Each structure stands twice: as C-alpha cells, then as structure tokens.
C-alpha cells in the first residue's frame, strides 16, 4: 500500500550497514520510499554512507537516498527516526571505562559511573534530535535504541513528555533468544513472557510457550548449571549466580554489575577495556570494508552482512506502521503498571504496540528484593538527570554515591572529579 | 481435541435453553463431553432441564446430561461453571423496582436502591456457588455473568480473593454490536476499543477499526442525533437516551446504564409504580419460555417450542475458549484495579480491557482519568463498597450510607424510608443489620 521515509540518526555507526542490509531483507513487511542518514560528524558518516549508497543501488535503486549533517535536510519528510548515536564516540567510552577502574570501581558503557558519564553526555544530544524531529516532521516517531536508555529515557520523560519517542533495548531480545535455544523452541516469538524492571535491570516472572506450557522449571534447572549459555560469553554464564538470589525469576544479565561488582572489577583490566577491543576490531573492520566497497563500486569487495538481530527494530517500526498489536518489552512511564513502584519511573515492561504507540500491560505489586534494588537504581538515574537540569555537582555526587557499584561516598567523589575533568567538552558546568 | 465439562448454575433460567442451543452451535470451537444443570429450585429447573434434554438428544446425544439440586453431583468433575442465578427470582425483583418508586426513586434491576437490594441478596448465593466449586472441582473456572456484578465482584474480591472467578458483563457487547452497524462494519470484532469504568458505569475512550482508523467521528455524529439506535420498547428507550448521556463528554461514548445516574428524574417520570419491568418479564418471557419448554416435553420434539439460538451469549464461549485454549483474546472484564487506572482506588473492581489466556486475565493499563468520570466513579464505587461493608459487618448505618450516597437518591431521609421498606421485603435473604 504505502512506502515509508526513514532517517537514521548516527549514520556514521559501524552498525548502520548491517541495519541497512536488514531493512532491504524486509521490504516485504516494511517498504521504503526514502532512506536518509544524519550525523554531526560528516567525514565519519560519508565513508559509511558512500558504501551503503553502493549496496542500496545494487539491491534497491528505486529507494531515494541521501546523507547530511543539516537537521532540516535530515528530519524533513520522515515517518520514522532510527536513533543510534554515541555522543563522544569510542574515545569517550574508553574514559567511561578506565576512570572508575583507577579507583577500584567497574567501568562499563551503561552501568556504574561509566554509564552515568555517558548519560551526562547523551541527554543534550538526544534532546536536540527530538527537537529537530518535532520541528521538521511533527508526526514522525523516534525509535531510540541508543544508550544509556535508562538515563536518557528519564530525561525525555521529564523534558519532552509528549514527544513520540519509543525507547527500546536489545538486551532482553538476546537473552530470550538464548532461552529459546535452551528449551528447544525455534525462536523467542514462540514464547510469551511477563517481565518488569528498569532498562538493563529487570526480571522475567513468567515464561511460557504459546500453548501455555510453563518453561520456567526447565530454564531454572538449566540456568542453575550453565547460565544463559545455550547447548549450541562470561556475562551469560554469570547469570547462573544472579538467578540464584531469586529462584522464581530469570534475571537480566546486566544485574551481574550490581550484584557482583567486586567480581567485575576483579576480572577488569584498567589498561585495556571493551572500548579498546571495538576500536581495534569492529571500528577498523567496518570502515575498511566500506572503503573497499567504495573503491570497487561493488558490495562484494566488503565482508559486511545482514544484522538479523536488529530485526526487532522493524518489529517495532511495523507494529506502529501497520498497528499489529505485537507484544514487546518497551521502556515507558510506569504510572501504575507496577502498582507499588514510583509512578514517574521509566520501566521496562510488556506492552502491546499499535499506531498510537504502546499499550502497557499491568504488572501488579513487586516483592521487596527487586523493589529495593530498583528504587536504589532509579534514584541514581533521576539524580543524574537532576544534575544535568540543575547543573548541580552535589546531585551527581549523590547519584554516584547511591550506585550499588560504588563502595562509598569518598570513592564516589574521587571518581566524580576525574569524570568532570574528562568530560569538559560535553557536560555543562556543575556548581 | 479436548472436550469440556460444564455445569450451569441457575438451570431454571429462561435463558438456559437459548444458551444451550448456543453451546450446541459452537461444538466446533468448544466441544463438550458433559453438561449439567444446577438450581436450588428443583420444580422450576425440571421444566427447563427436561425440555433441554429433548434438544440434546436431537442434536448431541453423545454429550452426557443431568440436572440436580445436589451440590456434590453438580460441581464434581467440571472445568467451568456458568453462573446465571437470580436470588429471589422475579417476585423479589418486582419489590426491588416498586419499593424505590413508592418513594419517588427509580427502581431497576442493578441500578439504584433496587440494584443494592438485589446485590444484598446475591452476595450469599454467589459465595456458596464459589465454595461448592472449590470443594468439588478445585481447578474449575467460574464464568460469572450474574448481576449485580459490581456489588458481587466487590464481595468476591474481599472474601474469595484467590478463587478462579471471571466477572463479565454483556451490556458492552450489545452496545458495541450496535456501534458496528452504525459505522457500517460487519460486526463488533472488526473494532478495537479502549474503555474504563465500573461495571454498568463506564466509557469508551478509543474506537477504531482493526487497522487503526478512527470510528469516533462518525459515531459522534450519529449518536448525537439518534443515540445507539442503529439504521436498521424498554431497552429501545435506553439506547436512544444515550444521546443525552454522551453530550456531557463529547470525546467519549458512554455505557447506557449511565442514564440512570445522570437522568434519574427522567427515569422516575417515565416509570409506572404499579407495573415495572419485572411484571413485563413475568407476563411475557417467564410465561412463554416455560410454556414452550412444557410443549417440547409433552410433544417430545424441540420444534414444538419456539426456542431460538441465543447468538448474543456467544461472548461466554469467547471467554471460556480464551481460557481453555490460551487465545490471548482482548475483552472487557471486571478485575481489581491495582494501578490500571492510576489515579483511581487500587482496591476498586473496574471494567477494563484485558488479554485472556489460560492463567486468566492480563489487564491493560488505562492511565489517569478526568475529573468528571473520576467523580462519578468514586461516588458509585463508595456506594458498592458500603453495600459490602453492610453485608460483612451486618451494619444498618453502612447500608443507609450506601443508599444515601447514590446519585439516584435525593436525600438521606428518602434513603432511610427506602431502606426500612427494603429490609422488611428482604427478610428471608439479607443477613441481619444492627
Ligand atoms: N544495533 C545497534 O545499532 C546497536 C548495538 C549496540 C549498541 N547500540 C547503542 O546505540 C548507540 C550507537 O552505538 P554504535 O556502536 O551502534 O555506533 P558507533 O559508536 O559506531 O557510532 C556512533 C555514531 O553516532 C554519531 N553521533 C554522536 N553524537 C551525535 C549527535 N548528537 N548527533 C548525530 N550523530 C551523533 C557519531 O558521529 C557516530 O558516527 C550506542 O549508545 C550504543 O550503546 C546500538
Ligand atoms: N442468562 C443470560 O444470558 C442473562 C441475560 C441478562 C441478564 N442476566 C443476569 O444473570 C442473572 C440470571 O438472570 P436470568 O433472567 O437469566 O435468570 P432467571 O431469572 O430466568 O432464572 C434464575 C434462576 O436462578 C435460580 N437460582 C436463584 N438462586 C440460586 C442459588 N443460590 N443457587 C442456584 N440457583 C439459584 C432460580 O431458581 C432460577 O431458576 C441475573 O442476575 C441477570 O441480571 C443473564
Ligand atoms: Cl517528574
Ligand atoms: Cl581482527
Ligand atoms: Cl494508547
Ligand atoms: Cl543544562
Ligand atoms: Cl488501541
């Protein structure tokens, strides 16, 4: 019937090609009349964009394509914005990981002080995107799968409460995929689940096949021995220890950072972090492939391939486009879904997705263990956004001090000072 | 593939035959190995059951059939209980309607002091059915479409919080059916809606076709001129009157029962204290169905009675099948609020959209509701909770408070006069009130 207009914010992402490839393999369920790229780093995006221009011309030359650094040109005439930006890129991620480690605190992209720092950089970036979208395409939907979703979602809830923004996380997708393999189902869409939490901080409470057969027993018996490692890395295996605290549920893998922070630090190397691995491998590999493709005018000159994993974004996009009522986990204002939890908290819960966005299902009352953990972590997140809004040093020191990943307020302060000096070019002045 | 065992509580209901004919026409989606009727009025059930037995022998002789007044015989080996009991029957309903009218207050089956009286009689009966079910078939589900659901659901929420009871109402089904004809769709299942309220006291907030097209603009235009009367005497007046009820909040569509709360003066004005709805049903439906059943028995053939399939009732099979086959079908059910309507009492029973599967309902959130509806619902839910307070605590003042608080009642003095009459008339059903 109709073809859609999509703009990818963060066109310079090393995941942009795989995603474009995935979109092309899904023109049957989600056809496009136009595809545009947007980035604030022109030179970086150009390499990714010229390579994709070749791919698109090969598999779908009928699709109108363009890339730019100009918001008006990028956000004009679009139905959807796919946002995957990394304010500060990998050089800043390296700082997020190493600074906490100098003080004996885990350094990670979205958890602990590292995540807090990334969130402080990301809030402004994402608010700008929202403002461009509303100005040039007031009816468009933004599919934000950027990080740290918990902090950024709190900011958009607070400062852009009526903006058509959908915050989604792919971590649960990956864990459900492994759970499916473990119990022997062909994919995660063969399961129906109940879940609650914050982004990167939740639990499955009910896991059944489509017929209603309870899969929890089978998963409990297996996960207790091997974690989320299917019969076919460390994070998935460690889920074994996370799940033992509450035998009746299945935990999100990111909970290892909050329940076993001593372990993460113990297995961390302050000299080489994950950002270093990506910069040494993925960053060069993808750009080298794009350079090769441009030089040849053929995609085959590159080893890029489809990111079937990212198909959940099309699930979301199509749910809205064709009002499918598909059931999926989204980050939404709680407002009674979890009855005994803060109404103004952003929570990750099951929702039906239609053309008007999500219809969250009720969750009910949650127990003291999860409630206590979530209350602590959402306060951290809300303090980070307080610090950004109010340009308050004490609000951020409070946030860091409150984190379960941080042993004391003195260590929290030492880290905060180091973080301030490193993020001078991104954070507002803190008083 | 799997066959179900059902018992109908209220076998002597004039709706039982039409419902049985409905079950028979749906053996494809809901196969039965067994069907049983239960009633506490043997002689009345016997006429209905013996007539239905002739129908089952003609259409489904494989289905095991029996009727009884024995709870053990009735509630043993069942998967579902379909409960449609009317404690006190029509003679008591006549009292519910006429006592308030004698004092210038509307008399109605489930709304106003009549509804309150019927609820006081029903709580005990339903608590008994639930206890029998749990004792003789612990794993069975009760499909309760009896009335007055708002009072009874509040009672079971407090006193049988963990029993497997699904509270459902058929009024929204009928109104949606009419809405569909009005917009021109094939049927109500071609629409997806959002709704909130108490039983017999709610509003549709969103009405779309399955593709998401807005049907509210066309409905507003039509309803503002003719109410819910489709293009195509009692109910016909109520559907037309929705015109006036809907005008208070143009952005929504109301449940027809709201006419009793927003236009109670109108209802009293168009009421006859000497002949009420109960008298109409008694002189028509009660006579006709029993005479038809009596004709089928005497002739030994279904064609001897003018019994028609109750296609409307099919919603009961939608519910039963959703549970039995984990279909995730979306429908309105009466469930504990507990945050679904965020700015409304968590312990209130609310009528809202739910997904229904084998574990029962999964309610959808509603969000915050506006002052108008919140005000009306807070008033009415307090009435309902006061009734159950009166029942539980055996308190006269609690029921006087309940009746006084009703938007159908003008004052505490009128409320007290009505209460004293209802007490005398319900001598054999109500618990004592100190
Ligand atoms: N499937 C995916 O795309 C995927 C996978 C994992 C994580 N993520 C998350 O999505 C985000 C993107 O990470 P990545 O590794 O996919 O991309 P990346 O780190 O390879 O590149 C990020 C791009 O965003 C651009 N950018 C930064 N700030 C911007 C702004 N204000 N406006 C416009 N563009 C801006 C940068 O110039 C850069 O080209 C991260 O937060 C990450 O946690 C996405
Ligand atoms: N059956 C339907 O589809 C339908 C339609 C509209 C309304 N209702 C509602 O359902 C209820 C039944 O109404 P009706 O007109 O269908 O029935 P009815 O008045 O025709 O018959 C009611 C039956 O329930 C029996 N009964 C009363 N108390 C009982 C008890 N404690 N245990 C067992 N049986 C008992 C009576 O003896 C009688 O046989 C009412 O509350 C009514 O508002 C049902
Ligand atoms: Cl707030
Ligand atoms: Cl390599
Ligand atoms: Cl909605
Ligand atoms: Cl600021
Ligand atoms: Cl909807």
Author numbering:
A (entry chain B): 1 to 232, 242 to 440
B (entry chain A): 1 to 232, 239 to 440
Please quote the paper that reports this structure.
Here, we report the deposition of 14 structures of enzymes from both the core and accessory genomes of sequence type 23 (ST23) K1 hypervirulent K. pneumoniae. Targets were selected using a shotgun approach aimed at uncharacterized metabolic proteins from ST23 K1 hypervirulent K. pneumoniae. In silico multilocus sequence typing of all K. pneumoniae isolates was completed using Kleborate. This analysis showed that 64 of the selected proteins are part of the K. pneumoniae core genome, defined as genes present in at least 95% of all strains; the other 132 proteins are part of the K. pneumoniae accessory genome and are overrepresented in the highly virulent hvKp clonal group CG23, which contains ST23 (7). Thus, the x-ray crystal structures presented here provide the basis for functional analysis of 12 uncharacterized proteins associated with high-risk K. pneumoniae infection.
Of these targets, 34 were successfully purified from large-scale preparations and entered crystallization trials. Fourteen structures were determined for 13 different targets as detailed in Fig. 1.
